């Protein structure tokens, strides 16, 4: 046969966990902690580990159901295994945080049906199951809802009262992944987002990690080390804000990710040496990355400015996202934000007109606050261009 | 060639219909009535009948134009039919409702162009056509707005001012059929709720039957007998409410569909075994099934009255879509649903009290209303769990 | 190989351009201009000629940095090459316009990025790239926010506020291309119309041109001749208005657009022979054609009058989406509009009463202002067609 092949499908995956072959693997690490897997033939058990071990204890226990499958929050840790000939498949939450006393409970699947995927947000649970269902969970274990997925999943994450969810949209063809995901809101009042749309990646690749900002902003990389964030502002798009190739001090060497922060605007990850993942010991360092979105002509100031103003303004969306959800949020940052992206505006008017483009210059005081535009006027009158101060007049009459 | 396989597409058929290579078949049955095709050497001739015989009298109509594709409504008979190399594809609506005396009209479609499905709603009627285009009519035959599907169309189904369409979105693989569906709202506003968007299916499944419940909610049934709705209360996603195969006592037994009723709750479907679908002859009676979301651990009576509350949940959702449209219902219903529901959530707290999981009833209470919460709290005080009752109070406190 | 096949893709193109290889072709003809490339071994050169002028003086440039996508607005006019051994992509505007002191500015891409698209709206323009990007700058070479494409773009257009792209949206079979379209309104407040949803297409057809109406609205082409255009007021479906293919006086004939305009309803194109697409000499000459909706019994008076005012309703639509976003219109057009409507309501409810077709009668009377439900109420009066009388006098009365 000479024409094209489709895809082999990605399977499912635990964002932020290592393969299932290692004796010693992750099971997660995330922003709450670590969790290690130590599966030898001589013992079978799970590590707990917190970043802040006051969350809750540093905890060892036997994987006796050889759970295959969990994931680590503020307030629980949350536990699976396949079904086998023998039994369902289990669902085990070890809720540390309760003020009741029985912090642990179990549920078992109906009898056929298999956990592919889970996660936690705030006082939920919710799993991904081989019936292409999703189950929702309290924390405390109360079922809450059930619904059917539009394909095979690939991949889930939770923050807040948010859910996000990848899966198998279509046949993918010559190394594509046909990927579409569903983003819900599970508030008093419950939205989907996102209704299964087409999800954005690199040629010839895969998904490689989900997530949430700290902040809580859906966010992903994939096989290509492409970082994308949900830039709500911009019509819920998708923006690529890194790419982690530029790094790589030997082109095998790659980077796998563990966090991401806003602000302050950092990239958590772990530098890999001539594998896709670490491994579990000797226990790897986590690097540090600061974002840096793709604009062109990068060399220049200008471009340099241009990106370091969309960078900040995309960076402080999650406080108007916030704000819009009723959650509580520091102001100060915002004027802070505002401040910096007046003078990053104000930077790049003062070059403009050095450079004669005074159109660029109404163009850049579009985007200015109008303090930030009456400060142009008098700027512009003071450099004796007048044109530019009347256009900046009339512009402030405008706003 | 040593790939995996597109599947064969799945072809348009009328929902609750019979084979066309029988001679005698059901061309639809509904909750209205059912309409059988009599292609015999004694007869080539159509037979109309109502359920409730006080709709309209029995009417019998031959069949000479030949027509293949059929629908029943309390207003009006629509038939379709292919061109010819000679005919135009003919849509011929009999409006036996009308006050007016005139009471059937025949419209023929363009060259080349075939009818492939038809539906009825409130006051109008709407066909499907190898153009890949939309017809819209009214009950008396004024042309209505023409637009454009995204592909092959598959069914439709039409209530009230709704109609729910679904078609081939893409090519499906091993097995899997890859069907989207489309929703819309031609009130006086018109609306577009789902935008072409994936439709849920068992694996390698394909569409067995879609419609409305009674109460107008969108459903729909696959080839493994998962009747799926679509969920309102949680932003338009499809949940499982039914598996009939724990019902096909036999693995040839099969259930088609007729009707759904959200309220008494029934499932209303002929059983058929060693077929999909049942002959025209000897007729049919009509079995009733109940409703049953896949909830886990459903031995236990946590489960069951999880179940219990969530399904009473669901089937009340159209009493919110009906105040959202202005239409009206007994607000007791409300009332009594919701007093289901706060009696349910009552016995799964003071079982999760008993059970000492104290933060599971605040779990189930943050889902009561402030009554109910009140009566918990009274409940919690009398059996002295006061944690608990303080707990409760600050909810009560919060709400 | 035994199975159907993934068709191969449709390769992207500019709309109102044709092919590559032909030395001396049409980069871009729209209602503004006409941009021809002349691409001779000695001499490597574009002509821009305006419809107007006045706008700015045809200009000849010579082609150095071998531009070969280009487009051109009311503004500036955009041009784009791609990458070499020794250059960067680069996006060359060249912006006539302005009133500060060039009228001109280059953007270079990122290594191994490369233009596949770009389109120039209000104050703006954008650029598809080979990274599977959008980048967009105002008309002053700003950069402006950017983010991730869907999949492989096709092509793109601009108008006002709107940016509209099509791109492939899966693998499509036997001939389909799958194809999938994002609209975007880029004001101080952004929104996403359509996220990605399947583009309506004739089977085994591919996308011919792309564009808007001189009114704002998006409205495309495929290789088959059907013009289909956004209806905003059928919740954003898409209605065909026209079958070139009725003009195809010879069957090899083909119309190459140029541009659309609802309020006169006009189609301009250019009608090719043998050719799917004009030669640049001898300097080819517009054609202008009317729109017909594909409506049935378009032969008899009652399909004609059906025909004329759906046709008169959608040319209208434009008014109240300019009028909800701010902008000025022609509020004499709408009531003239609105009096078409009334005159073909008339005269089909007039129609049809001397059909004694009195229940559609009532039908038509309900898309009428009240007014004209007066009207035809004392037109029923004095054909003492009481019955009718009485059932438009209580319609008359529910308004």
Redesign the interface.
Same mark, same amino acid.
């Given at each position: +046969?000479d024409? !094209?092949?489709?895809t082999p499908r990605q399977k499912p995956f635990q964002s932020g966990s290592t393969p299932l072959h290692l004796t010693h693997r992750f099971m997660v690490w995330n922003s709450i902690g670590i969790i290690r897997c130590y599966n030898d033939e001589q013992d079978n058990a799970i590590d707990v580990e917190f970043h802040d071990t006051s969350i809750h204890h540093a905890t060892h226990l036997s994987n006796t159901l050889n759970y295959t499958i969990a994931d680590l929050s503020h307030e629980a840790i949350l536990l699976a295994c396949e079904s086998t000939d023998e039994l369902a498949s289990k669902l085990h939450c070890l809720?540390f945080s309760?003020?009741?006393?029985?912090k642990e409970?179990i549920?078992?699947?109906?009898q056929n049906e298999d956990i592919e995927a889970i996660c936690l947000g705030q006082?939920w649970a919710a799993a991904a199951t081989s019936?292409?269902?999703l %189950?929702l969970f309290?924390?405390?274990?109360?079922?809450? &809802?059930?619904?059917?997925?539009?394909?095979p999943v690939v991949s889930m994450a939770g923050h807040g009262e948010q859910l996000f969810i990848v899966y198998h949209?279509?046949?993918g063809?010559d190394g594509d992944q $046909?990927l579409?995901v569903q983003l819900?809101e599970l508030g008093k009042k419950?939205?989907?987002i996102?209704?299964?749309?087409?999800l954005?990646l690199?040629?010839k690749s895969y998904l490689a990690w989900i997530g949430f900002s700290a902040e809580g902003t859906p966010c992903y990389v994939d096989s290509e080390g492409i970082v %994308?964030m949900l830039?709500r502002?911009?019509?819920?798009?998708?923006? !690529?804000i890194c790419n982690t190739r530029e790094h790589c001090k030997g082109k095998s060497d790659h980077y796998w990710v563990v966090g991401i922060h806003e602000n302050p605007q950092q990239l958590r990850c772990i530098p890999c040496k001539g594998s896709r993942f670490p491994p579990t010991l000797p226990r790897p360092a986590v690097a540090i990355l600061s974002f840096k979105?793709? +604009? $062109?002509?990068?060399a220049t100031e200008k471009?340099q400015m241009?990106?370091q103003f969309?960078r900040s303004v995309?960076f402080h969306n999650h406080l108007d996202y916030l704000a819009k959800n009723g959650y509580e949020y520091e102001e100060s940052t915002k004027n802070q934000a505002t401040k910096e992206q007046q003078e990053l505006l104000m930077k790049?008017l003062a070059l403009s007109c050095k450079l004669? %483009? &005074?159109?660029?210059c109404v163009?850049?005081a579009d985007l200015m606050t109008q303090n930030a535009v009456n400060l142009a006027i008098k700027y512009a009158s003071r450099s004796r261009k007048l044109?530019l101060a009347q256009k900046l007049s009339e512009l402030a009459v405008e706003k």
């Open positions: +046969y024409g !094209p092949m489709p809720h309760s003020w009741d006393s029985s409970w549920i078992d699947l109906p006082g019936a292409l269902l %189950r309290t924390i405390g274990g109360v079922q809450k &809802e059930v619904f059917s997925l539009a394909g949209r279509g046949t063809f $046909c579409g819900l419950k939205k989907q996102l209704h299964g749309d087409p954005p690199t040629r %994308r830039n502002g911009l019509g819920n798009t998708w923006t !690529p979105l793709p +604009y $062109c002509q990068i471009g241009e990106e969309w995309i790049m004669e %483009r &005074e159109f660029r163009e850049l044109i």
